[PDB]
Amino acid sequence: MVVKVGINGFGRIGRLAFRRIQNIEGVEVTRINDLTDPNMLAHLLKYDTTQGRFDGTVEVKEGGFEVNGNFIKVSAERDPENIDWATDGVEIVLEATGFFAKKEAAEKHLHANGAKKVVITAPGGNDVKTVVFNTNHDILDGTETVISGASCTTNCLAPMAKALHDAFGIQKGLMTTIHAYTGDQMILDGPHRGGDLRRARAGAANIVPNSTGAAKAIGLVIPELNGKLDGAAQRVPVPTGSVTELVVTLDKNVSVDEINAAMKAASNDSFGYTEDPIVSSDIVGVSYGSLFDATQTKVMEVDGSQLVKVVSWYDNEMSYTAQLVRTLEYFAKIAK
Amino acid sequence: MVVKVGINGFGRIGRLAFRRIQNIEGVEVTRINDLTDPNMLAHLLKYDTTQGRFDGTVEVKEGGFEVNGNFIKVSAERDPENIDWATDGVEIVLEATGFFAKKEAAEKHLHANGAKKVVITAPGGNDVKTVVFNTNHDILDGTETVISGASCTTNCLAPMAKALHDAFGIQKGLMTTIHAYTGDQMILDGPHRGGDLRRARAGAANIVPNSTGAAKAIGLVIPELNGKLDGAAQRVPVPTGSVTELVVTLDKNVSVDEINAAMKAASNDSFGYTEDPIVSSDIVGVSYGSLFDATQTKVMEVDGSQLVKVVSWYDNEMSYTAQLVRTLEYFAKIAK
Amino acid sequence: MVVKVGINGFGRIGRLAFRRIQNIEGVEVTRINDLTDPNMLAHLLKYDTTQGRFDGTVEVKEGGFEVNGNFIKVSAERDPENIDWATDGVEIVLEATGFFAKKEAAEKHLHANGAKKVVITAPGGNDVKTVVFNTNHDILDGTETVISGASCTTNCLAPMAKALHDAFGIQKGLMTTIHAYTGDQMILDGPHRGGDLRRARAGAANIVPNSTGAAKAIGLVIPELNGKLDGAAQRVPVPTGSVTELVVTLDKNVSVDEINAAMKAASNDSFGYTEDPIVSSDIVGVSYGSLFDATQTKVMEVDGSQLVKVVSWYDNEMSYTAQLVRTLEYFAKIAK
Amino acid sequence: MVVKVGINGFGRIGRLAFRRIQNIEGVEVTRINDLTDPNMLAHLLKYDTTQGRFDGTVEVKEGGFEVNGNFIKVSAERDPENIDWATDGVEIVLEATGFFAKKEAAEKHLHANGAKKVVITAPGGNDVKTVVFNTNHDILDGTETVISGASCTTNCLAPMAKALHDAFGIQKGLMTTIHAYTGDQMILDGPHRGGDLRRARAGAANIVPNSTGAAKAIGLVIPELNGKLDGAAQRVPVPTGSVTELVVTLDKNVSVDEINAAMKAASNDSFGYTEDPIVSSDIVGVSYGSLFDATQTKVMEVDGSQLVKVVSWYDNEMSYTAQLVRTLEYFAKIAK
Ligand SMILES: NC(=O)c1ccc[n+]([C@@H]2O[C@H](COP(=O)([O-])OP(=O)(O)OC[C@H]3O[C@@H](n4cnc5c(N)ncnc54)[C@H](O)[C@@H]3O)[C@@H](O)[C@H]2O)c1
Ligand SMILES: NC(=O)c1ccc[n+]([C@@H]2O[C@H](COP(=O)([O-])OP(=O)(O)OC[C@H]3O[C@@H](n4cnc5c(N)ncnc54)[C@H](O)[C@@H]3O)[C@@H](O)[C@H]2O)c1
Ligand SMILES: NC(=O)c1ccc[n+]([C@@H]2O[C@H](COP(=O)([O-])OP(=O)(O)OC[C@H]3O[C@@H](n4cnc5c(N)ncnc54)[C@H](O)[C@@H]3O)[C@@H](O)[C@H]2O)c1
Ligand SMILES: NC(=O)c1ccc[n+]([C@@H]2O[C@H](COP(=O)([O-])OP(=O)(O)OC[C@H]3O[C@@H](n4cnc5c(N)ncnc54)[C@H](O)[C@@H]3O)[C@@H](O)[C@H]2O)c1
């Protein structure tokens, strides 16, 4: 009754997903594929700048490493169609490299003696179901071969936008996420391999504007909001931890207290609520996908009409990963 | 016809104001007051983490220091009433400590052996004239005893909001400034003397939400926008350099290109225009009070109505200081 | 038989000491004195940028706050003579403000309605007993009224220097500690109240040389090394976490392996040993006072004589605090 | 009388070398080769996080870009033997990619219709002359096909070690350089493509120990010191700017003043001298290869013998680049 999982890309999301999977019964990781040797991967699992020391033992072995005595095979195949996942019983692959985040590319894992299903740890295109756990995981039926866990920002934005929309009716909106720098930025100014003149700049030494598709693509998660939102990011020098601001007009006039109460009423394991005046370091490592912050709510009313601002925190690392593993765990129970 | 100026508070703004005044003919600094000895102040003028080495020579002397051979007297009086500005011929004081930023407090400089006029390098309350150079410096007549150079954020916001309002009619708006950390934050978590639970946190290690009065108080500079705007800040880990986002509804529907063209048409020495995809380090040390970034403009249109987003950069240090010294120079020329 | 403790200065060391005392049976904190209101102190206990969320509940009350339901009284007296420690049963005060770190100043806590004994959380001069737990806590007899827990650097240096000296005989040495920035540095360039032209500079944006008395003062802990060592610091942009390098000449020639084996043989709960290639974030929050890093050992031999380099990590916050509370617990158990 | 130069690798050193070459008469850059398009390279030349805006105009064109109206060809050939340098008149190549830093690899530029000589902007192996300008550029005769400009640390260490050795006789020494992070570190924890478990860690969020060969290889520059020194690095979170500490024993006993005077006597355009208590931001952009800091000198004397500590600053970017371009300019005059 345990589904065997493989991780392609033992990066920030891959390693934290591995960490969370150590505390759930329904799945286990039997194989990791990356581009390096087992000693590099074992060391990066054991020691983690932002998420702390690993909870357990890690011992490098020939061809893999042992976690609390259990051997995990490590391979270094650059091409997914060359990974023989089935040899190690792997049925579902977490595709966490950032290089195969579309249906046709992720399908490369599904070859003979490969895997059966793929969860992309990122937006995966419009022909792949895009799931924010506890907002729209109802759309899965288990027959899908490739699904998407969406982005960090989408998992933050979606429960907040859904709750506000259901209560008051979102007409239109603009989003800004103030976001930690990530591994797709350069450590120091240099050529960006994706052509982005702003991610080319030193990520820990600048406020860096950058594009994000979370608001424009929200219809994959909340169909009623298709075509109603847009937004962007300001990437700033913290190594993890982020926040999403959303400014909207609504069908109903509201008060600050009414907004905050509507968010609290929607709170659950994915969507948290706080009235404490926290800062970004306080959400590093949290398990909420989105933490609504009532201290930042604003309503600007002039001449009987309002602009409404709502703000939610997210650890783009652990908040996203908690949501990803919730979706993986659910998908594994229904996969067919 | 050269007006003698004193600086109270030889801090970030005080020292950079001194630097800019070295290239102005109409004013000269003859006296500095702070809380320390001349060697400390001379060293901090010569060496500057974010704004570079001083352009000239600085040499400590008895009771002050020489800048390019010219002696500047230094005193260390905590109470402005005890500063004998008149001994050094000072007529106008730049009040840059952060502790006397209101009319009655700034008037402490005005006494028999004191000065004649004060420019507060900060918001100064609603009963003193508040000037953003090249937006409303025509409200000065030279008879004022205390004026305000507004805040960094106000000098960024004002030319952008005025150009947008004049062209299209701002109905209501919300502002977020993503702002460099400043000296009123704690270097590491600890009790904040002002009672602010967020400025208590380590400023170079967090995204820190905090309040800002610039949007609400814009009516002191643009009277037609009184009651129309509000906003807040996200303080982030860069030691200087900031950006202001403004989301509004307007009386007229517009396009992105129409907005950008209206901003460019309003550009001058205070309000710059760029289409280059810059980041915060690129505006450190600039002399614009506000640098509009056309790459960040957005229009979100639903059902015939729009949200409009406009964004402008500012070096909260040198951009503000350039505006402050423009205002000081003008005020001194017409002073009576 | 539980000794009641007060904390003067609920700062980085004061708050982390409180956290560690929650897991010690022999002492309990009944009173905190600082300069602010209880809401500020409660918030700073609950949320901590570098050391994570508090393990328990914290709730503000009238005149203090409750920790896991237990009320802690809070006062705000700037002068230690005015703190009525005895009202709350306090016998031993942790003097953690940084402003009373000498015998006569710490004695201000000792009066009719005050405390009985003081532990200074810092060097306290050459006339108070200076204790590094598990190196020289046997010098205490419990009759002392004022003792010192030494500095962070001393607690790192002492077990390493003692093991090396006992095995091989230290003749002379120089120390460099590459140290996290601390609260006595300015967040941005500005006048330093202590007159230090380098701690005046932006602490999270520079490599900052600064003085350290730990090596010169080591004779208070290891008398045989009086007059043999000196050193200095390079303060760098991490908010906590530090490392001590020591270069010596010895009475005996040695090999790298011989040095490392001597360190490992001396390891205990205070002095750890590692061969993993860790970085500073890996020691944040550790409970060793000193963690020897065998990967950094060097022997430079020319013409039959050697320079020897040994290196040990320390979290200047939690490593020091773990040592401080070990000493407090021991001192309270034998106090008379 | 102008020698035409090509740059392979328009990175930190490549772009800053280009910037410095704009102010010297004897050489000009006619071709840049990297891995990207001209718009990326032009943008990175124009805007520079740590070294400021480019002094001039940059305009992208087809197949290259214009600098102050002069067209520079850009190509994107991954393999040096495929670059037809001679088509653009290039005689000397600055090999600044980091991927061809050995004689056999650098020689790939010297094929038919290629270049004539290569200067590696890094250590290049022991069969390549290794030059620190104004310390040993006398060893060049111009017949060499491949030479090395050494490392940043070597250019800092060498004039200081030479002056100390000539004056007093270095017996043995150990070096620690506290160094800015560089582009060979990961922005966030992840697999390091060189296998380095410490450069795998987030470079702007850690104190990172790492190896350096500058001390052990000093004999390539100062033959008398072969086999007498060793050392290592602590890489810390500043984006440029570094410092080198050296601890030695000498043939003569000395005083602090005697050491400082010997360094000042050796000062020139490459080796500067200061007594000001500066920090790392103060040496960003300087043109000295090495800036001796008299405030950090120490002499630890016990029982008639001494340990001696000397310390010099360097901008690992511009200090190294100034030295590199001095060597290039000299080599171009004598190349045959
Ligand atoms: N970091 C975040 O905040 C975050 C949040 C949500 C989603 N994501 C998404 O998750 C994915 C991974 O991001 P990350 O931050 O963990 O990146 P990362 O760079 O830390 O990890 C990528 C890993 O993939 C490996 N890799 C690269 N190419 C490979 C190949 N061909 N085969 C096997 N392994 C390969 C790398 O060696 C590395 O270990 C991306 O799609 C990203 O958009 C990231
Ligand atoms: N830094 C910015 O981005 C910025 C921008 C615009 C306006 N301002 C405003 O300018 C003022 C100064 O800000 P700053 O960032 O330069 O602060 P700062 O802390 O760098 O400088 C304040 C200076 O005042 C001195 N000082 C304090 N109390 C004093 C007293 N009683 N008498 C004499 N000197 C005293 C301090 O020693 C220090 O040198 C504030 O009102 C601030 O709001 C700051
Ligand atoms: N942070 C470290 O790495 C470290 C390590 C070892 C020792 N120490 C020592 O511990 C002491 C505290 O250092 P810290 O880093 O915790 O400093 P901190 O600035 O974080 O804390 C000092 C606290 O004392 C309070 N305070 C100041 N003056 C006071 C007064 N007159 N009465 C009551 N409270 C007052 C402040 O409000 C603050 O909460 C210093 O002696 C320091 O040298 C610090
Ligand atoms: N940054 C420093 O402090 C410093 C100091 C002294 C020496 N160096 C040395 O200079 C060299 C460059 O270092 P950097 O910091 O400028 O690195 P960098 O990463 O900034 O620049 C390397 C450049 O080379 C390009 N490149 C990579 N492979 C290539 C190929 N096959 N063909 C063409 N171009 C290619 C990259 O796109 C990039 O623009 C290294 O050898 C380094 O050790 C660096």
Numbering used by the authors:
A (entry chain B), B (entry chain A), C (entry chain A), D (entry chain B): 1 to 336
From the paper:
D-Glyceraldehyde-3-phosphate dehydrogenase (GAPDH, E.C. 1.2.1.12) catalyzes the sixth glycolytic reaction. GAPDH shares an evolutionarily conserved fold consisting in two juxtaposed domains, an N-terminal NAD-binding domain (NBD) and a C-terminal catalytic domain. At the boundary between the two domains lies a catalytic cysteine residue. The active site of GAPDH contains also two structurally distinct phosphate-binding sites, the Pi and Ps sites, where inorganic phosphate and the phosphate group from the glyceraldehyde-3-phosphate (G3P) substrate bind, respectively, during reaction.
We have determined the first crystal structures of SpGAPDH at 1.50 Å resolution and CpGAPDH at 2.55 Å resolution. Both crystal structures correspond to the holoenzymes with the NAD+ cofactor deeply buried into the active site. The global architecture of CpGAPDH and SpGAPDH consists in a D2 homotetramer with O, P, Q, and R subunits, with three non-equivalent interfaces related by three mutually perpendicular axes (P, Q, and R). Likewise, for SpGAPDH, Arg235 interacts with Thr182, Asp184, and Gln185. Comparing the adenine-binding subsites of AvGAPDH with SpGAPDH, there are two important substitutions: Ala95 to Arg (although the interaction with NAD+ occurs through main-chain hydrogen bonds) and, analogously to CpGAPDH, Tyr117 is a Phe in SpGAPDH. Furthermore, in SpGAPDH a Gly residue substitutes Lys210 of AvGAPDH, completely eliminating the positive charge. In contrast, in SpGAPDH and HsGAPDH, an arginine side chain seems firmly inserted into the adenine pocket. The three GAPDH enzymes exhibited roughly similar values for the kinetic parameters except for kcat (and kcat/KM), which was significantly greater for SpGAPDH. Anacardic acid inhibited GAPDH through a non-competitive mechanism with respect to both G3P and NAD+ substrates. While curcumin is an uncompetitive inhibitor with respect to G3P for SpGAPDH and AvGAPDH, it behaves as a non-competitive inhibitor with respect to NAD+.
